[PDB]
Symmetry: C3
Subunit: 396 residues, 3 copies
C-alpha cells in the first residue's frame, strides 16, 4: 500500500537505480556488435556529457568550500575539526589495509614522491586549476591536492584577519551556494548519463576480483556502518539511503573527485549534516581518505605475490601511503601500485595483468572511498557538537 | 555652414571612416612590392595590437554581462526577455536564409555536433577562458559559447538566491563597468589599428561575391531597418549612425565577438539602450544570431551546386543551424559550411574554391551579424517596456 | 654582552645568512662526486620547493597590489607618485650604465620589440597569468609585464568610478593582505630552501666577472645609498638591514620577480614604508627598474668588444632600453644582450662565451635590481609626503 508514496518521493533516486539496471542490460545487448573505438566513444557520449558537467563544478566547489570552511570556524576549533578528520581518515585507511591483507592471505618511484611534493606547492594557481605536474613536464588535468592545500591555508589567513577577511568569506560563501544550486540541474541529467556511462564501460584474476569485491562489502557494509553506530548511535543504513545518489554516481564515474558535488548535495540536503563540517570533511576526504583504494592496494600487491612469491608491515605502511597519494580520478589505483610494489621488492610490470579487470573494481572501490567521506562527515559532525553549539549561540 | 560642428562632434567616428578610406589606399599602394609573409605580418602589426586589446576585454565582458544581466531581472521577466530575443534571432536567421536562397536562384560531420555539445558543457572553467574543444583534442582559443551558457545559468542561480546573491551581483556589476571604462581607451587606438588591419588584408566566383554582397545590402539596409521601424516606429538609419563605430570595426576585425566591447559602448552610450537588456541581447547575439553568415551559407552551398548540380528545405534548415553553431570568430563561415554541404549531399572539398574571395565577404557578413544584434537590442528594449518600468519604480 | 639579544631578535635573518655560509660549504663538499643532471635536480629540490612557493604568490600579489595601489590614490596624486617613480627609475638605470661603461674602459631582433609590444597588450588575461608570447608561439611562464600594465589601467578605472569601484577595491585589498599573510609561512622555509638553491648552483672572463662584481659594489653600496641619504637624510645601511632577507633570497633565486613577495614583507614590516607606495613602486620596479642588469649589459657588450673590437652612446641608450625590456626572471640578462649587440654591430653569437660565468653574476645583479626598488620605495615615500598627509587626514 505504502509503495506508491515511495515511488513519488524517491523519484530521482529510483531513476538512477533503474539507470544502472537498464544500463547493464543495454551494454550486454550491444556488446557482440562491431566494438569500433570511435563508435564506443559516440555510444558512451551521453555519459561523457554528465562527466563534463560534474568536472566543471569541482574547481569552484573545492576552492570556495575550504576557504569559507576554515575561515567560518574558530582558531583552535578549525584544528580540532581537522584533528578529528585526520584521526578518522588514518584509522579507517588502516582498518581497510588490515582487513584487506587478512582476506588475501585466506583466499622513477622517487620521481613519484617529488611530483606529489611539487603538486602540494603549485608554482601557479591559474595553471593548478587545469594542470598537474608529472616529470618526464606539466600534464593536463586539475591539481586538486594543490588547490585543497592552498584553499586550507587561504581559509586560515582570512580567519586570521578580522572584518577585512569577512568580505572575501562572504564572496566565497555566495560562490559556494551558487555552484551548489547548479548541481541540482546536474542531478536531473544523472539518470540519463549514468545509463550510457556504465553501458559503454561494460562494452569495452578470478579469486582476485572476488577477494576485492567481497573485501569491499565487509568494509563498506559491515566495518564502516558499525563505526557510525559506535560513535553517533544512529542507524547507518538510513544515512547510506540519503547519500545513495552519490554512491550510484561514483559507480558510474569511477572518480570520487567528480562525484564530490553530488555527495555535497546528498550530505547537505538528504541528510542533516552541517555545511561548516562538510566544507572541510568532503574536499579533504575526496583526495586523502581512500579506504576502498587502500584495501585494493594491499590485495593486488599480494595477489601478484601469490604467483611470483613477514614484511607485510611495509605493504600495510606503503598501501596506506599510496591511498593518501592516489587521485580522486579513475584508474589512479593501478598507477599508485608502483610505490607498494617497489617497497616490498616485486616488479611494477605485473600491474599489466590486473589492468583488464581493474575497471569494474575501480567502480566499487570509488563507492567505498565516497562512503568513507560521507559517513566521515556524520561521525565528525556528532563529535564536534560543542564547537557548532558555540558558533550558533555567538550569532544570537 | 553646419558641417564644422559635424567635424568637431563626430571626431572619433570620422577618424575611423578615414581609417577605412586611407587604409584601402595604403594597401593598394604597397601591394606590388615583395609580399613576404613575415613582412605582411610586420606591416599589419598596428592592426594586430588593436585585435589583442579587443580580444582581452571579451572574457571579463561576456562573463560579467550575463551574470548581472540575468540576476538583475525578475524570474519570468528573465524568461520573457530571453523569449523575445530567441523569437527575434530565429526569425531574422530565417528571413536572411530565405532572401539568400531566392537571390542565388536568380543569379567528421557528426564530430562537429559532438564538439559543439561538448563545448556547451565545459569540463573546466579556467580552461574554457582560453581553450575550445576540437576532437582529432583541446585547441587554443576561448570557448565563448561554453562561457555564455555557464554565465546564463550562474546569473539565474544568483537571481534564485536572495541578498546572499546580491554581493556577487554587485561584484560582477563593478567588474562590468570597469572593463567598459577600458573600451574607451581601446576606441582611441581603433582609427590607427583599423587602417593597418584592412591594409594588410587587401595586401594578402564573380557572380557569387556579387550575390552575397548585394544580398547583404537587401538584408542589412532594407530588410532589418524595416523590422525596427515596424516595431519601435523610430528611424533605423539614425540608430545605425550610433553603432557606426561598431560596424567599421567589424569590417576591420571580421570577428563579431572581438567587436562586441565596442558594440556595447555604441549601444550603451551613442544610443539610449538599457544595460539590463544589452547585457543579454549583445553577448547571446554575438554567438547565435548570425544573419550575415546564414545568408552566406545558403548562397555558397547553392553556388557550388550551380557548377556541380526541391531539397532546398534541408539547406534552409541546416544553413540556419550552421549560423547558430558558427563562432563570432573570422573565417568561421567556411568551416561550418561542412554541415550544410553534407546535409544536401554535395562534397565538402568544394569549400577550397570559395576560400580565396571569402576574406572580403567575411568583413561584410560580420557587419550584418553585428547589425542584427544592435538593432536587436533596440527591438527587444522597446518590446520589454513594462518589465523595465516595474524594475525602475520598485527601487523608488 | 648585547650579542645575545641580537641572536634572539634577528633569528630568521641570521638563519638565512647561515643558509648562504653553510650552503656554499655543502656544495663544494659534494662537487667532486658524480654530477648526474637527474641527481643535481634531486639534490637542489628543497630549493625548488621554495621557488614554487614564491612563484605561486607573485600573481595574486602583482594584480591585487596595483589595482588597490592606483585606486586608493587621488587622480593626479597617482600620476605624481608614478612620475616620481619613473624619474627615479630612468635616472638610476642611467647612472648604472654610465658607471658601468667607465669601469669596463678602465679594466629576429625586431621580433623582440614586437613580442614585447604584444605582451604589453595580452589577448587573454587567464592565459597571461601562466603564458608569455614568444614568436617562432605562446611559451609557458607568466606574462608579468602584461599583468602589471592591465592592473595599472584597471586600478585607474576603479579610481575613476565612485563607491561602485569601492567594492572591488575592498575585494582586492583583502586579497592582498591574505596573500601577504602567506609570505610569512614562505619566510620560515626560506633558510632551508636558500641552502639547497645555492648549493645546487655552485655544483652545476677573469677581468669581466671582476669588473661586473666590483661595478655592482660601487653602484649598490656607494652610489644608491648616497642617493637615499641625499633625499631622505636617513641612514641607508640601517634601511638595507631591514630588506636584508629580500637580498639574501634574491641571491638564491636570481629572480627579482620571485623575491618580490619577501621584499614586500621586508619593506612593509621590517621598515616603515607605506603600503600605498610599495603597492606601486615594488611591482613596477621588479619589471622595469633593473640597475644591476643595466650595469651588466654595458660591461658584457664592451667585454666582447675588447676581444672583437665614440658610438658608446647607442650602447648606453640600448643597455638602458634592454634593462626595461628584461624580465625579473633568471638568465634574462644574456637573452636581452641581443638588442645591445645588434645596435652597435657586434655578433650575438658571442653571448655563448659569457654564459658560463653568467649564473654567479646574475645572483649579484638581482640583489642590486631588488635594492634599487627597495631604496626606491623609501625615496618616493619621503618625496610623496603631502600626498599621504592629505589621504590620512581625509579619513578623519
Ligand atoms: N577511483 C578512485 C581512485 C582509484 O583507486 O583509482 C577514486 O576516484 O577515489
Ligand atoms: N566572421 C563572422 C563569422 C563567420 O561567418 O565567419 C562573425 O564574426 O560573426
Ligand atoms: N636576474 C635578473 C634579470 C637578469 O638580468 O637576468 C632579475 O631577476 O632581476
Ligand atoms: Na587519496
Ligand atoms: Na552563431
Ligand atoms: Na626590466
Amino acid at each position: 500500500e505504502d509503495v506508491k508514496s515511495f515511488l513519488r518521493r524517491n523519484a530521482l533516486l529510483l531513476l538512477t537505480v533503474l539507470a544502472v539496471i537498464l544500463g547493464v542490460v543495454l551494454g550486454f545487448l550491444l556488446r557482440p556488435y562491431p566494438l569500433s573505438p570511435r563508435e564506443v566513444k559516440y555510444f558512451a557520449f551521453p555519459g561523457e556529457l554528465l562527466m563534463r558537467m560534474l568536472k566543471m563544478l569541482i574547481l569552484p566547489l573545492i576552492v570556495s568550500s575550504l576557504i569559507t570552511g576554515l575561515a567560518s570556524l574558530d582558531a583552535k576549533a578549525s584544528g580540532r575539526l581537522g584533528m578529528r578528520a585526520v584521526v578518522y581518515y588514518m584509522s579507517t585507511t588502516i582498518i581497510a589495509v588490515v582487513l584487506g591483507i587478512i582476506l588475501v592471505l585466506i583466499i622513477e618511484v622517487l620521481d613519484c614522491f617529488l611530483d606529489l611534493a611539487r603538486n602540494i606547492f603549485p608554482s601557479n594557481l591559474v595553471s593548478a586549476a587545469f594542470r598537474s605536474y608529472s616529470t618526464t613536464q606539466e600534464v593536463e588535468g586539475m591539481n586538486i591536492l594543490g588547490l585543497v592545500v592552498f584553499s586550507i591555508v587561504f581559509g586560515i589567513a582570512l580567519g586570521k584577519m578580522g572584518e577585512q577577511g569577512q568580505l572575501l568569506v562572504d564572496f566565497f560563501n555566495s560562490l559556494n551556494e551558487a555552484t551548489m544550486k547548479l548541481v541540482a540541474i546536474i542531478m536531473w541529467y544523472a539518470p540519463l548519463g549514468i545509463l550510457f556511462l556504465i553501458a559503454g564501460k561494460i562494452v569495452e584474476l578470478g579469486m582476485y576480483m572476488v577477494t576485492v569485491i567481497v573485501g569491499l562489502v565487509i568494509h563498506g557494509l559491515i566495518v564502516l556502518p558499525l563505526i557510525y553506530f559506535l560513535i553517533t548511535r544512529k542507524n547507518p543504513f538510513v544515512f547510506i539511503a540519503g547519500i545513495l545518489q552519490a554512491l550510484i554516481t561514483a559507480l558510474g564515474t569511477s572518480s570520487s573527485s567528480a562525484t564530490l558535488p553530488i555527495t555535497f548535495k546528498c550530505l547537505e540536503e538528504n541528510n542533516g549534516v552541517d555545511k561548516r563540517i562538510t566544507r572541510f570533511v568532503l574536499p579533504v576526504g575526496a583526495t586523502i581518505n581512500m579506504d576502498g583504494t587502500a584495501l585494493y592496494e594491499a590485495v593486488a600487491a599480494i595477489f601478484i605475490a601469490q604467483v611470483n612469491n613477514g614484511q607485510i608491515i611495509t605493504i600495510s605502511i606503503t598501501a596506506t601511503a599510496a591511498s593518501i597519494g592516489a587521485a580522486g580520478i579513475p584508474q589512479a589505483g593501478l598507477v599508485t601500485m608502483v610505490i607498494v610494489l617497489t617497497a616490498v621488492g616485486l616488479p611494477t610490470d605485473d600491474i599489466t595483468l590486473i589492468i583488464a579487470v581493474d575497471w569494474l573494481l575501480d567502480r566499487f572501490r570509488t563507492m567505498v572511498n565516497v562512503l568513507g567521506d560521507a559517513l566521515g562527515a556524520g561521525i565528525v559532525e556528532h563529535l564536534s557538537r560543542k564547537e557548532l553549539e558555540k558558533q550558533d549561540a555567538e550569532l544570537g
